[PDB]
Amino acid sequence: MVTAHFVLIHTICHGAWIWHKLKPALERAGHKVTALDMAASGIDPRQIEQINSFDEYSEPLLTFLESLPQGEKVIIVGESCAGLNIAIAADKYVDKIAAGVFHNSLLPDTVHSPSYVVEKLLESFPDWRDTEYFTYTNNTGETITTMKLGFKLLRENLYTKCTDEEYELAKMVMRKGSLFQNVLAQRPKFTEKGYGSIKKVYIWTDQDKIFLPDFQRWQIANYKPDKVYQVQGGDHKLQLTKTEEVAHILQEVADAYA
Amino acid sequence: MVTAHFVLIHTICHGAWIWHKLKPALERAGHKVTALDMAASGIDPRQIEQINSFDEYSEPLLTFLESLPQGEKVIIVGESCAGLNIAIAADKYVDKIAAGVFHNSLLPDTVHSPSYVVEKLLESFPDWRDTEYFTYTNNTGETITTMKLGFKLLRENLYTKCTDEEYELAKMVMRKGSLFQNVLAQRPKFTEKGYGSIKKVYIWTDQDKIFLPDFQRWQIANYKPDKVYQVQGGDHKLQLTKTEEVAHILQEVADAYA
């Protein structure tokens, strides 16, 4: 068994804290784990209204990869919307990425616009329930839509099978988030030499109540991952409801690609 | 029953998230629970360097108490340094407070300087180990010392018996904090009419590895609580290591004072 360095990237609205179970589980097997707050996420001090694009939102990941000792490679694990962070990172630091791992995650491709799978997600799940939407104006006058995830959506669609303590934790540290969808729609496509070339492992459960089974299967058919690991049971937050099974899969990713 | 409403107040550097286990446990017994971030704590958007005193730090507690409808009383539960928040609040909103509950907490009095029990704490536990210290200048030219709690202090002295997952969580959301000790040392003493008159319940364990038994026993002798509950085992974070037992005690507090 290989040991690897895993970089865990939370989804919009969330923070590094979502990985509080997975990080020590991985460390038990001797892996290195880095869990980062993206901009205006977790306890990052920036407010979302000062962030102008999904690329700017991903700054902490890019900054960390720039500082990685030369010659080292990482496995980037992204949950939910963080597949976009993986693609952004791979188009700057392909040489530093052993694999990208998608965890009930958006799976961008190279032949469509970066906003493509966001559009498809929202078509598949258009009603975010008690989630509240806000707008602000960015750097160049664009209106950015932010969301505060609703408590019922959190309880029933994101944390469906998580403990009550985990759900209360989520409410206690959740931040606003944004897809920056209109800015993604004008962004250059992810490149073949960068994102297109990395190994891609897709982890998912058909019990996910926001990234629904027809949507996730559509993503898999749209851009075939190198490996697909389906996990039985759990919910959208497999790193909480199926922590050990995720850690075991991540070991297999290290054995294959690290 | 009269609904008991517990207002849970974290310690410096922490946030409402520290109560993510105790809050659903209390709600299982039918109580109302409010867990607040203090200024520059948890996901509060202010930075500590803009805060000028422990009273300013207490603003979210004071603003919440202001919002309470007439006739509604709360039981304020403070952990560790939050005993100071209880005294500050009680001097402004005594009629809204059914009781203050101290949870391995500083227990200020009314006859010494507000900084008195902070000085005694630091005499008893002077070495905060790998903690890092920083300074800034406040509202009146006082230099404020802030701290970033060190990982070893967190692991061994605060979260001694907590799960690895809880310790990892703590590292992912911890903020800077300050005792504002030199500002407390110039603050008017807490009043009899306000803080002195609230009912006070002292919960502690002699296995606390930062608020040590000679210090905690000294506080009890210095300022007699109405009730003392000593919990066997656990650690400084009894709301994590002894959640159900703390909830049982808080039921007794509600029976006595709600």
Short mmCIF file of C-alpha atoms in Angstrom, two decimals:
data_model
loop_
_atom_site.label_atom_id
_atom_site.label_comp_id
_atom_site.label_asym_id
_atom_site.label_seq_id
_atom_site.Cartn_x
_atom_site.Cartn_y
_atom_site.Cartn_z
CA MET A 1 0.00 0.00 0.00
CA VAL A 2 1.23 3.42 -1.08
CA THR A 3 0.94 6.52 1.08
CA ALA A 4 -0.22 9.70 -0.67
CA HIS A 5 -0.90 13.38 0.01
CA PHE A 6 -4.64 14.10 -0.27
CA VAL A 7 -5.89 17.67 -0.72
CA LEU A 8 -9.56 17.78 0.35
CA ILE A 9 -11.71 20.53 -1.20
CA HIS A 10 -15.15 21.30 0.27
CA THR A 11 -18.11 22.53 -1.79
CA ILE A 12 -19.61 26.02 -1.96
CA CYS A 13 -21.10 27.25 1.35
CA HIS A 14 -19.04 24.68 3.23
CA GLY A 15 -15.47 24.73 4.58
CA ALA A 16 -12.57 22.45 5.46
CA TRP A 17 -14.60 21.33 8.51
CA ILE A 18 -16.67 18.96 6.36
CA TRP A 19 -13.59 16.72 6.21
CA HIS A 20 -13.18 16.43 10.00
CA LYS A 21 -13.94 12.69 9.93
CA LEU A 22 -12.14 11.75 6.71
CA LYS A 23 -8.87 13.52 7.51
CA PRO A 24 -7.94 11.42 10.59
CA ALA A 25 -9.23 8.25 8.90
CA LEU A 26 -6.79 8.82 6.03
CA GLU A 27 -3.98 9.76 8.42
CA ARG A 28 -4.46 6.42 10.21
CA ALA A 29 -3.01 4.73 7.10
CA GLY A 30 0.00 7.08 6.98
CA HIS A 31 -1.29 9.47 4.33
CA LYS A 32 -0.75 13.21 4.44
CA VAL A 33 -3.96 15.27 4.34
CA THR A 34 -4.42 18.97 3.61
CA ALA A 35 -7.92 20.40 4.02
CA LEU A 36 -8.36 23.99 2.84
CA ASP A 37 -10.98 26.70 3.15
CA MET A 38 -11.75 28.22 -0.23
CA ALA A 39 -12.30 31.97 -0.37
CA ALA A 40 -15.21 33.22 1.80
CA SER A 41 -15.77 29.66 3.02
CA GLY A 42 -15.37 28.04 6.40
CA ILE A 43 -13.52 30.53 8.57
CA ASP A 44 -11.88 32.32 5.64
CA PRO A 45 -12.14 36.04 6.52
CA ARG A 46 -13.13 37.24 3.05
CA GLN A 47 -16.81 37.91 2.36
CA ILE A 48 -18.30 36.45 -0.80
CA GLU A 49 -19.18 39.95 -2.07
CA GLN A 50 -15.45 40.61 -2.58
CA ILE A 51 -15.05 37.49 -4.79
CA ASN A 52 -15.61 37.93 -8.50
CA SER A 53 -15.38 34.48 -10.12
CA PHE A 54 -15.19 30.78 -9.33
CA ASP A 55 -11.50 31.00 -10.20
CA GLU A 56 -10.95 33.67 -7.54
CA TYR A 57 -12.99 31.52 -5.15
CA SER A 58 -10.47 28.70 -5.78
CA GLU A 59 -7.46 30.86 -4.90
CA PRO A 60 -6.49 28.93 -1.72
CA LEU A 61 -6.16 25.70 -3.70
CA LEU A 62 -4.02 27.31 -6.40
CA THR A 63 -1.88 29.09 -3.79
CA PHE A 64 -1.33 25.84 -1.91
CA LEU A 65 -0.35 23.97 -5.07
CA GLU A 66 2.12 26.71 -6.01
CA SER A 67 3.85 26.17 -2.63
CA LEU A 68 3.91 22.36 -2.88
CA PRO A 69 7.55 21.18 -2.89
CA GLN A 70 8.62 20.69 -6.50
CA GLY A 71 8.30 17.12 -7.71
CA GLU A 72 5.56 16.23 -5.21
CA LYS A 73 2.12 15.20 -6.42
CA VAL A 74 -1.25 15.25 -4.68
CA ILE A 75 -4.60 13.55 -5.06
CA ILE A 76 -7.23 16.32 -5.04
CA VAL A 77 -10.59 15.14 -3.63
CA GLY A 78 -13.54 17.40 -4.36
CA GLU A 79 -17.11 17.08 -3.06
CA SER A 80 -20.31 18.35 -4.68
CA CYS A 81 -19.52 21.60 -6.54
CA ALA A 82 -15.76 21.19 -6.00
CA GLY A 83 -15.21 19.23 -9.21
CA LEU A 84 -14.94 22.74 -10.67
CA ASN A 85 -12.05 23.47 -8.31
CA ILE A 86 -10.34 20.30 -9.54
CA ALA A 87 -10.61 21.36 -13.17
CA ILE A 88 -9.39 24.89 -12.43
CA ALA A 89 -6.45 23.49 -10.49
CA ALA A 90 -5.53 20.97 -13.18
CA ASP A 91 -5.25 23.73 -15.81
CA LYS A 92 -2.52 25.39 -13.75
CA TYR A 93 -0.74 22.52 -11.95
CA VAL A 94 -1.16 19.33 -14.02
CA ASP A 95 2.36 18.19 -13.11
CA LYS A 96 1.45 18.27 -9.40
CA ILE A 97 -1.74 16.18 -9.62
CA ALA A 98 -1.62 12.39 -9.35
CA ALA A 99 -5.41 12.13 -9.69
CA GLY A 100 -8.64 14.03 -9.18
CA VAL A 101 -11.32 12.31 -7.10
CA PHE A 102 -14.95 13.37 -7.46
CA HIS A 103 -17.15 12.78 -4.39
CA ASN A 104 -20.84 13.10 -5.33
CA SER A 105 -19.35 15.86 -7.42
CA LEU A 106 -19.87 17.91 -10.54
CA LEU A 107 -17.74 16.41 -13.32
CA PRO A 108 -16.81 19.11 -15.84
CA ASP A 109 -15.55 18.04 -19.24
CA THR A 110 -13.39 19.57 -21.96
CA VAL A 111 -15.67 19.79 -25.00
CA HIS A 112 -18.44 21.86 -23.32
CA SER A 113 -18.39 25.25 -21.54
CA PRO A 114 -17.29 25.14 -17.86
CA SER A 115 -20.88 25.99 -16.85
CA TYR A 116 -22.29 22.94 -18.67
CA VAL A 117 -22.66 20.49 -15.80
CA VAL A 118 -23.89 23.30 -13.54
CA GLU A 119 -26.71 23.94 -16.01
CA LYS A 120 -27.46 20.21 -16.07
CA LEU A 121 -27.40 19.98 -12.26
CA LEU A 122 -29.87 22.84 -11.91
CA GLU A 123 -32.13 21.33 -14.58
CA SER A 124 -32.08 18.06 -12.62
CA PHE A 125 -32.59 19.79 -9.25
CA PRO A 126 -34.20 23.20 -9.85
CA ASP A 127 -35.93 23.63 -6.45
CA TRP A 128 -33.47 24.29 -3.63
CA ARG A 129 -36.43 24.52 -1.23
CA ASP A 130 -35.92 26.91 1.71
CA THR A 131 -32.56 28.06 0.30
CA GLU A 132 -32.54 31.85 0.03
CA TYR A 133 -30.93 33.68 -2.91
CA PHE A 134 -29.16 37.04 -2.85
CA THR A 135 -27.35 39.17 -5.41
CA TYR A 136 -24.35 41.47 -5.36
CA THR A 137 -22.42 43.27 -8.09
CA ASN A 138 -18.88 42.09 -8.81
CA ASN A 139 -15.66 43.82 -9.98
CA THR A 140 -16.89 44.54 -13.48
CA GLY A 141 -20.59 45.12 -12.90
CA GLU A 142 -21.93 41.57 -13.20
CA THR A 143 -24.67 40.46 -10.85
CA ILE A 144 -23.60 37.39 -8.90
CA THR A 145 -26.23 35.16 -7.30
CA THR A 146 -25.38 33.79 -3.85
CA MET A 147 -27.27 31.26 -1.78
CA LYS A 148 -27.83 30.59 1.91
CA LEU A 149 -28.74 26.91 2.03
CA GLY A 150 -32.05 26.27 3.73
CA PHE A 151 -32.25 24.18 6.88
CA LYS A 152 -34.71 21.69 5.37
CA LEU A 153 -32.52 21.29 2.29
CA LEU A 154 -29.57 20.71 4.61
CA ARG A 155 -31.45 18.21 6.78
CA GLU A 156 -33.19 16.23 4.07
CA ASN A 157 -31.28 16.65 0.80
CA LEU A 158 -27.62 17.15 1.81
CA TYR A 159 -27.28 15.55 5.28
CA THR A 160 -30.11 13.02 4.81
CA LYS A 161 -28.49 10.21 6.84
CA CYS A 162 -25.94 12.21 8.83
CA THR A 163 -26.16 12.35 12.60
CA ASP A 164 -28.15 15.10 14.28
CA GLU A 165 -24.88 16.42 15.71
CA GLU A 166 -23.40 16.68 12.22
CA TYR A 167 -26.48 18.50 10.93
CA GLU A 168 -26.35 20.97 13.83
CA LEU A 169 -22.64 21.49 13.16
CA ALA A 170 -23.45 22.26 9.52
CA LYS A 171 -25.97 24.96 10.51
CA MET A 172 -23.41 26.36 12.95
CA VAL A 173 -20.66 27.05 10.40
CA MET A 174 -22.35 27.22 6.99
CA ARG A 175 -21.51 30.24 4.79
CA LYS A 176 -23.07 31.81 1.71
CA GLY A 177 -21.91 30.34 -1.59
CA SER A 178 -22.12 30.94 -5.32
CA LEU A 179 -21.89 28.92 -8.52
CA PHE A 180 -20.74 32.06 -10.39
CA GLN A 181 -22.66 30.39 -13.19
CA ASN A 182 -22.84 33.37 -15.56
CA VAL A 183 -19.08 33.94 -15.21
CA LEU A 184 -18.40 30.23 -15.75
CA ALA A 185 -20.45 30.47 -18.95
CA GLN A 186 -17.93 32.93 -20.42
CA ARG A 187 -14.85 31.11 -19.09
CA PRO A 188 -12.54 29.31 -21.54
CA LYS A 189 -13.06 25.57 -21.62
CA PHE A 190 -10.94 23.33 -19.46
CA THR A 191 -7.93 22.20 -21.46
CA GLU A 192 -6.96 18.74 -22.66
CA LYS A 193 -3.29 19.08 -21.66
CA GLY A 194 -4.22 20.08 -18.11
CA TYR A 195 -7.59 18.91 -16.80
CA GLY A 196 -8.23 16.56 -19.71
CA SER A 197 -5.11 14.54 -18.93
CA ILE A 198 -5.48 13.87 -15.19
CA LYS A 199 -6.73 10.54 -13.90
CA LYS A 200 -10.33 10.90 -12.71
CA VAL A 201 -12.04 8.73 -10.08
CA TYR A 202 -15.78 9.20 -9.48
CA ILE A 203 -17.28 8.20 -6.10
CA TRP A 204 -21.04 8.36 -5.63
CA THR A 205 -24.13 6.86 -4.06
CA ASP A 206 -27.54 6.39 -5.64
CA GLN A 207 -29.06 7.47 -2.29
CA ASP A 208 -27.86 11.05 -2.82
CA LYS A 209 -30.92 13.29 -2.45
CA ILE A 210 -29.58 16.39 -4.24
CA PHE A 211 -27.16 15.04 -6.87
CA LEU A 212 -29.78 12.59 -8.09
CA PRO A 213 -29.07 9.20 -9.70
CA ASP A 214 -30.12 10.15 -13.24
CA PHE A 215 -27.93 13.24 -13.03
CA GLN A 216 -24.86 11.41 -11.73
CA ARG A 217 -25.24 8.61 -14.27
CA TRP A 218 -25.60 11.29 -16.96
CA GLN A 219 -22.30 12.83 -15.83
CA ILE A 220 -20.60 9.42 -15.93
CA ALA A 221 -21.84 8.78 -19.46
CA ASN A 222 -20.99 12.32 -20.57
CA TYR A 223 -17.30 12.11 -19.57
CA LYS A 224 -16.27 8.57 -18.65
CA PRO A 225 -14.08 8.58 -15.52
CA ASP A 226 -11.07 6.30 -15.31
CA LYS A 227 -12.78 4.57 -12.37
CA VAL A 228 -16.28 4.77 -10.88
CA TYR A 229 -16.82 3.57 -7.30
CA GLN A 230 -20.48 3.31 -6.33
CA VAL A 231 -21.06 3.24 -2.57
CA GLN A 232 -24.22 1.63 -1.21
CA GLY A 233 -26.39 3.66 1.14
CA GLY A 234 -25.28 6.84 2.87
CA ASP A 235 -26.18 10.25 1.46
CA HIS A 236 -24.67 13.24 -0.35
CA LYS A 237 -22.11 13.65 2.46
CA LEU A 238 -20.41 10.28 2.11
CA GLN A 239 -17.36 11.65 3.93
CA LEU A 240 -19.64 11.73 6.99
CA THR A 241 -22.03 8.83 6.43
CA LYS A 242 -19.55 6.39 4.82
CA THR A 243 -16.21 7.75 6.08
CA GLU A 244 -14.35 4.45 6.23
CA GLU A 245 -15.58 3.26 2.85
CA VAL A 246 -14.44 6.56 1.30
CA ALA A 247 -11.06 6.24 3.02
CA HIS A 248 -10.72 2.69 1.68
CA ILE A 249 -11.52 3.88 -1.86
CA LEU A 250 -9.02 6.71 -1.53
CA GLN A 251 -6.37 4.15 -0.58
CA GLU A 252 -7.16 2.31 -3.81
CA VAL A 253 -6.71 5.59 -5.68
CA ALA A 254 -3.29 6.00 -4.06
CA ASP A 255 -2.37 2.43 -4.99
CA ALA A 256 -3.42 3.03 -8.60
CA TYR A 257 -2.06 6.54 -9.26
CA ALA A 258 0.09 7.95 -6.43
CA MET B 1 -43.77 22.85 31.56
CA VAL B 2 -42.29 26.31 31.27
CA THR B 3 -40.02 26.01 28.26
CA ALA B 4 -36.43 26.28 29.40
CA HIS B 5 -34.38 28.30 26.90
CA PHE B 6 -30.64 27.64 27.12
CA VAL B 7 -28.28 30.19 25.57
CA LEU B 8 -24.96 28.45 24.95
CA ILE B 9 -21.83 30.62 24.90
CA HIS B 10 -18.50 29.27 23.62
CA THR B 11 -15.08 30.35 24.88
CA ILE B 12 -12.50 32.59 23.22
CA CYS B 13 -11.10 31.25 19.91
CA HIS B 14 -14.09 28.90 19.62
CA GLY B 15 -17.60 29.40 18.18
CA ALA B 16 -21.15 28.10 18.43
CA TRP B 17 -19.92 24.88 16.74
CA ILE B 18 -18.50 23.64 20.08
CA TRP B 19 -22.10 22.98 21.12
CA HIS B 20 -22.99 20.84 18.09
CA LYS B 21 -23.44 17.78 20.34
CA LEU B 22 -25.08 19.39 23.38
CA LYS B 23 -27.67 21.36 21.40
CA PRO B 24 -29.56 18.36 19.91
CA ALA B 25 -29.24 16.52 23.24
CA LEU B 26 -31.01 19.38 25.04
CA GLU B 27 -33.61 19.57 22.25
CA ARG B 28 -34.38 15.86 22.72
CA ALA B 29 -35.56 16.81 26.22
CA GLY B 30 -37.80 19.51 24.75
CA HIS B 31 -35.71 22.57 25.65
CA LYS B 32 -35.17 25.56 23.37
CA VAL B 33 -31.49 26.15 22.56
CA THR B 34 -29.72 29.18 21.10
CA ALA B 35 -26.00 28.91 20.35
CA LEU B 36 -24.32 32.18 19.36
CA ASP B 37 -20.99 33.17 17.84
CA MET B 38 -19.38 35.97 19.82
CA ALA B 39 -17.60 38.73 17.91
CA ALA B 40 -14.70 37.49 15.74
CA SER B 41 -15.58 33.92 16.72
CA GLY B 42 -16.86 30.96 14.75
CA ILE B 43 -18.06 32.37 11.43
CA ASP B 44 -18.67 35.88 12.75
CA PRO B 45 -17.33 38.16 9.96
CA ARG B 46 -15.47 40.58 12.24
CA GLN B 47 -11.75 40.16 12.85
CA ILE B 48 -10.47 40.20 16.40
CA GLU B 49 -8.22 43.20 15.70
CA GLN B 50 -11.26 45.49 15.41
CA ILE B 51 -12.58 44.46 18.86
CA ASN B 52 -11.60 46.67 21.77
CA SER B 53 -12.78 44.92 24.94
CA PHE B 54 -14.38 41.77 26.31
CA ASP B 55 -17.61 43.77 26.50
CA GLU B 56 -17.48 44.45 22.74
CA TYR B 57 -16.63 40.80 22.19
CA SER B 58 -19.85 39.99 24.07
CA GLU B 59 -22.06 42.04 21.69
CA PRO B 60 -23.95 39.10 20.07
CA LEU B 61 -25.02 37.84 23.50
CA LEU B 62 -26.14 41.31 24.56
CA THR B 63 -27.98 41.94 21.29
CA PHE B 64 -29.75 38.58 21.56
CA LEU B 65 -30.85 39.28 25.13
CA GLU B 66 -32.16 42.68 23.98
CA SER B 67 -34.29 40.89 21.37
CA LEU B 68 -35.96 38.56 23.88
CA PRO B 69 -39.67 39.33 24.39
CA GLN B 70 -40.66 40.69 27.79
CA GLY B 71 -41.30 37.91 30.29
CA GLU B 72 -38.92 35.43 28.65
CA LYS B 73 -35.90 34.29 30.66
CA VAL B 74 -32.91 32.25 29.56
CA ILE B 75 -30.33 30.03 31.23
CA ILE B 76 -26.90 31.13 30.00
CA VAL B 77 -24.34 28.31 29.77
CA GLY B 78 -20.76 29.49 29.41
CA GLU B 79 -17.71 27.29 28.89
CA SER B 80 -14.14 28.10 29.90
CA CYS B 81 -13.58 31.86 29.49
CA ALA B 82 -17.28 32.53 28.82
CA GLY B 83 -18.01 33.02 32.53
CA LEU B 84 -16.93 36.60 31.77
CA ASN B 85 -19.65 36.86 29.11
CA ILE B 86 -22.18 35.73 31.72
CA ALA B 87 -21.14 38.47 34.13
CA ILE B 88 -21.14 41.18 31.45
CA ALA B 89 -24.60 40.14 30.26
CA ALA B 90 -26.02 39.83 33.78
CA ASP B 91 -25.06 43.40 34.61
CA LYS B 92 -27.28 44.57 31.74
CA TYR B 93 -30.11 41.99 31.55
CA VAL B 94 -30.49 40.44 35.02
CA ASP B 95 -34.29 40.24 34.71
CA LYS B 96 -33.95 38.10 31.56
CA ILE B 97 -31.63 35.55 33.21
CA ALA B 98 -33.06 32.56 35.06
CA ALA B 99 -29.56 31.28 35.91
CA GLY B 100 -25.94 31.24 34.76
CA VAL B 101 -24.28 27.86 34.27
CA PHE B 102 -20.49 27.68 34.41
CA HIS B 103 -18.95 24.76 32.49
CA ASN B 104 -15.27 24.32 33.41
CA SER B 105 -15.53 28.10 33.40
CA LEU B 106 -14.04 31.24 34.86
CA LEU B 107 -16.19 32.39 37.79
CA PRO B 108 -15.77 36.16 38.19
CA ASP B 109 -16.96 37.78 41.40
CA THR B 110 -18.22 41.22 42.45
CA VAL B 111 -15.56 42.25 44.98
CA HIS B 112 -12.36 41.93 42.91
CA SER B 113 -11.34 43.48 39.57
CA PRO B 114 -13.01 41.75 36.59
CA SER B 115 -9.57 40.46 35.60
CA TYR B 116 -9.05 38.73 38.97
CA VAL B 117 -9.92 35.16 38.05
CA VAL B 118 -8.03 35.53 34.74
CA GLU B 119 -4.87 36.37 36.69
CA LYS B 120 -5.44 33.35 38.93
CA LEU B 121 -6.05 31.11 35.92
CA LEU B 122 -2.77 32.19 34.32
CA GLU B 123 -0.91 31.74 37.62
CA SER B 124 -2.26 28.18 37.78
CA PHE B 125 -1.66 27.44 34.07
CA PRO B 126 1.05 29.80 32.82
CA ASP B 127 2.44 27.69 29.94
CA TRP B 128 0.09 27.53 26.96
CA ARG B 129 2.72 25.49 25.14
CA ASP B 130 2.75 25.82 21.33
CA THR B 131 0.21 28.64 21.40
CA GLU B 132 1.23 31.65 19.28
CA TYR B 133 0.73 35.24 20.47
CA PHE B 134 0.09 38.46 18.54
CA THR B 135 -0.58 42.08 19.48
CA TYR B 136 -2.57 45.06 18.21
CA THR B 137 -3.52 48.47 19.62
CA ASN B 138 -7.15 49.05 20.60
CA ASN B 139 -9.62 51.98 20.92
CA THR B 140 -7.69 53.76 23.68
CA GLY B 141 -4.09 52.82 22.93
CA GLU B 142 -3.98 49.63 24.99
CA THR B 143 -1.98 46.82 23.45
CA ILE B 144 -4.18 43.75 23.14
CA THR B 145 -2.69 40.26 23.16
CA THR B 146 -4.39 37.71 20.92
CA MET B 147 -3.59 34.03 20.73
CA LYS B 148 -3.80 31.18 18.24
CA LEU B 149 -4.12 28.03 20.35
CA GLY B 150 -1.39 25.52 19.56
CA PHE B 151 -2.25 22.08 18.21
CA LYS B 152 -0.57 20.30 21.13
CA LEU B 153 -2.41 22.44 23.68
CA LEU B 154 -5.61 21.68 21.81
CA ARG B 155 -4.89 17.94 21.65
CA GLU B 156 -3.60 17.37 25.17
CA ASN B 157 -4.98 20.12 27.39
CA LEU B 158 -8.36 21.17 25.93
CA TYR B 159 -9.56 18.11 23.95
CA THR B 160 -7.66 15.50 26.00
CA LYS B 161 -10.32 12.76 25.80
CA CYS B 162 -12.28 13.97 22.75
CA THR B 163 -12.39 11.95 19.56
CA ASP B 164 -9.74 12.52 16.92
CA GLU B 165 -12.54 13.68 14.63
CA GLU B 166 -13.59 16.33 17.17
CA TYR B 167 -9.97 17.47 17.63
CA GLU B 168 -9.57 17.74 13.85
CA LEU B 169 -12.83 19.71 13.66
CA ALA B 170 -11.52 22.11 16.30
CA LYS B 171 -8.37 22.78 14.26
CA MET B 172 -10.47 23.42 11.14
CA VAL B 173 -12.62 26.18 12.65
CA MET B 174 -10.57 27.69 15.49
CA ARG B 175 -10.07 31.48 15.42
CA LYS B 176 -7.80 33.88 17.24
CA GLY B 177 -8.97 34.91 20.70
CA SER B 178 -8.14 37.35 23.48
CA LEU B 179 -8.67 37.59 27.21
CA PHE B 180 -8.48 41.40 26.94
CA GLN B 181 -6.87 41.01 30.33
CA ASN B 182 -5.41 44.51 30.71
CA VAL B 183 -8.74 46.06 29.67
CA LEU B 184 -10.64 43.88 32.15
CA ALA B 185 -8.15 45.03 34.77
CA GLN B 186 -9.34 48.64 34.28
CA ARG B 187 -13.06 47.77 33.99
CA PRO B 188 -15.55 48.66 36.75
CA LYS B 189 -16.28 45.63 38.91
CA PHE B 190 -19.31 43.48 38.22
CA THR B 191 -22.39 44.57 40.19
CA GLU B 192 -24.35 42.87 42.96
CA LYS B 193 -27.71 44.00 41.56
CA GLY B 194 -26.94 42.40 38.18
CA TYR B 195 -24.31 39.66 38.08
CA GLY B 196 -24.28 39.10 41.84
CA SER B 197 -27.99 38.30 41.99
CA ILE B 198 -28.26 35.59 39.32
CA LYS B 199 -28.38 31.96 40.36
CA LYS B 200 -25.07 30.29 39.52
CA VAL B 201 -24.41 26.61 38.78
CA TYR B 202 -20.82 25.31 38.56
CA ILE B 203 -20.14 22.17 36.46
CA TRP B 204 -16.58 20.86 36.30
CA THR B 205 -14.32 17.83 36.19
CA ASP B 206 -11.10 17.23 38.11
CA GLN B 207 -9.69 15.65 34.92
CA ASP B 208 -9.66 19.07 33.21
CA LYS B 209 -6.08 19.49 31.99
CA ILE B 210 -6.12 23.30 31.59
CA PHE B 211 -8.54 24.54 34.27
CA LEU B 212 -6.79 22.48 36.92
CA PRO B 213 -8.45 21.15 40.08
CA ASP B 214 -6.71 23.46 42.54
CA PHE B 215 -7.80 26.43 40.42
CA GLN B 216 -11.39 25.24 40.04
CA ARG B 217 -11.70 24.40 43.74
CA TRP B 218 -10.28 27.84 44.50
CA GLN B 219 -12.96 29.51 42.35
CA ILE B 220 -15.73 27.61 44.15
CA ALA B 221 -14.36 28.68 47.53
CA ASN B 222 -13.83 32.26 46.32
CA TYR B 223 -17.44 32.72 45.14
CA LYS B 224 -19.92 30.13 46.41
CA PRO B 225 -22.15 28.76 43.61
CA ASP B 226 -25.75 27.91 44.33
CA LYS B 227 -25.10 24.41 42.96
CA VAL B 228 -21.91 22.49 42.18
CA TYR B 229 -21.92 19.43 39.91
CA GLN B 230 -18.66 17.55 39.57
CA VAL B 231 -18.57 15.17 36.59
CA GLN B 232 -16.30 12.12 36.79
CA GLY B 233 -13.81 11.69 33.97
CA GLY B 234 -14.12 13.52 30.67
CA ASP B 235 -11.94 16.55 29.94
CA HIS B 236 -12.12 20.34 29.63
CA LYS B 237 -14.69 19.93 26.82
CA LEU B 238 -17.39 18.16 28.82
CA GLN B 239 -19.99 19.15 26.20
CA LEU B 240 -18.08 16.78 23.87
CA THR B 241 -16.80 14.05 26.20
CA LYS B 242 -19.80 13.95 28.61
CA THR B 243 -22.59 15.42 26.47
CA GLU B 244 -25.47 13.37 27.88
CA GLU B 245 -24.37 13.85 31.49
CA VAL B 246 -24.13 17.61 30.96
CA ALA B 247 -27.60 17.53 29.40
CA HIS B 248 -28.94 15.64 32.43
CA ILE B 249 -27.43 18.27 34.74
CA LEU B 250 -28.92 21.07 32.67
CA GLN B 251 -32.33 19.40 33.04
CA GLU B 252 -31.86 19.71 36.82
CA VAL B 253 -30.96 23.38 36.33
CA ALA B 254 -34.15 23.88 34.35
CA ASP B 255 -36.19 22.10 37.03
CA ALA B 256 -34.74 24.43 39.65
CA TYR B 257 -34.76 27.77 37.84
CA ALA B 258 -36.67 27.77 34.53
#
